Amino acid sequence: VMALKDVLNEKLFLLACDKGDYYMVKKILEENSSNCVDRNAVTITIENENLDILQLLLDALLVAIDSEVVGAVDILLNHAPVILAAHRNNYEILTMLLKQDVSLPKPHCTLCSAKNKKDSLRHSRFRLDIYRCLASPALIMLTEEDPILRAFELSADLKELSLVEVEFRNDYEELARQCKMFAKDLLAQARNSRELEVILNHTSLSRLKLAIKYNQKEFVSQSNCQQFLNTVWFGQMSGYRRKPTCKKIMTVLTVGIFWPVLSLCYLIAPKSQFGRIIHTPFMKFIIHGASYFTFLLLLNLYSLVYNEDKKNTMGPALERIDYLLILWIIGMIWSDIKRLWYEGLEDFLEESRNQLSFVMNSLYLATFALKVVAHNKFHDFADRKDWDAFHPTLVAEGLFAFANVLSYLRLFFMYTTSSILGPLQISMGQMLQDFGKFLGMFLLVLFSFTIGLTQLYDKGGIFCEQQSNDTFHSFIGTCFALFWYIFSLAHVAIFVTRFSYGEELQSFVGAVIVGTYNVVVVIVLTKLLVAMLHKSFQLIANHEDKEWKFARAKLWLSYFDDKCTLPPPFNIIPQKRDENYQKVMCCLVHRYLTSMRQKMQSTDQATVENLNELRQDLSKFRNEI
């Protein structure tokens, strides 16, 4: 058994101040005329909103703000605190407290390093306390001139701090999310298109481009922002949306088919009726799309018009079709430097479509550089079967075929425009990150079994009709054989594991090693991969609409600039507004305050409760007098 153990006027004064006692506290003050802890004997009265009793005692501050009692704070102020007030995120006390001049030190030196040596837990906590005060929606509205821009910059600031402060990761990304949701709610108060155009065109579509740079996905997906995008995207052809589905397709096909004419008309008469057609973004996207579709058609026709007598030619000359492809490739390349030069390396390299253009453009230059050199060096007439394995003509055709795969794979970005295949394509893009983690673990398993298998057989391939044991006689051959076992489609037979001359025991051991590899990879690693794709997809499915809309708006904005207007073959050929912004800002800010109050003040319990409090004050006064 274990025995549990805990390891007069002041009491009359404390009990009196607890429960609505004013006159006989005045009596206790009279008795004392002739700091107790259960506390200054005043904090209890502060939390009870007994201002009359409080005023009598006055004739703590941080506790009053923690209780959000405006009356107590006002009396205490009449008879850092700002940082704690901003934590509570409310307007009345924040306005009153800031009326007196108040400063707040900015966060990061050599001096700060000295403090971190003495106490690092305290140093980290203070920095997070300041940033939580700065990210208060009430404080930004009352202190900042451009609340929308302030929320954009702070949100990007707080996201970076989460990466460095790994242990404070959760707290910081909660503050960044709060900043993003504030700027989106400010935009939702716009009422007409005049206010919408003022907000989204201000410069410190600069605001619209700034949101894309700062990854404001919630801001972009708002209905006001989406409606504004549609008008600019379609431009003067707003009647396109009124046309039926059968009439829409005939308009797109007609514009695409006559793309060479429209691109030529803008070249000679830019100001004509047909010249200005390209200027609207939607038709520019179609013209650029139809230009690329003809480039892929030329590649398909390259083999069809290939003369059979050139298959045995070692130094074939460039055909007319070859000159056409050279013109397109220079056109595609020329547009690439322009985009990179106007934006920068990091912005340009970030998009996957741009990366696929880098590799395929170098491969197209290599095959044509090799083709010209081969025609000038090796022109002999000999059959194909007698050439060297690494002849320049054979190397040129290997690079050309590889670049054709990357040309057709660039069409993935065109699925983003569609509202049916758009969300699905974005969902598949985000699940590719989970595949990379499985590659690291599987790559070590494949390397482990390759070591043992080549040790057992080399002392004593799969691409022949009769597969033999010779696939295990090299490191490269062993890796290829194990690679084709992953599918479970019986690409490689078991007879391969058997030694050619005998080695009865060593043949059985090699078969057991391969059988263990199959169970580990095909039955264990594959099922584990499916388990996470089931888990990750459910989380992704939640934000499917918000992610797709951000990707579509990013793609549309690239066609708003007039820097690149001509298609690739044709491209190679040679205080007044700040005052208006402030007027809209004050309207949006004041609407937000009014709207937000109804969001949380709906039950009205503190109205009837306040009436009951007045009733109790009157009742206590009655008997007391």
Binding site: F449, G452, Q455
Partner: protein, 65 residues
């Protein structure tokens, strides 16, 4: 097994004539299996990585079923 095989035999013989339970063959098979097992020990170092380590722990937790 290598020492036993070295002590027992002094002459040379073609491989195709040896019995299946010759000590040398068992030694080579055990060496190959030991190589395979030794290469797999690197999985225990995945715990130090923020990306690979959670996947390694989750895989270990699901092996009971």
């Amino acid at each position: 097994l290598k020492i036993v095989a070295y002590v027992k035999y002094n002459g040379s013989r073609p491989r195709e004539e040896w019995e299946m339970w010759h000590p040398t063959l068992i030694a080579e098979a055990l060496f190959a299996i030991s190589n395979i097992l030794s290469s797999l020990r690197l999985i225990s170092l995945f715990t130090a990585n923020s990306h690979l380590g959670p996947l390694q722990i989750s895989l270990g937790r699901m092996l009971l079923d």
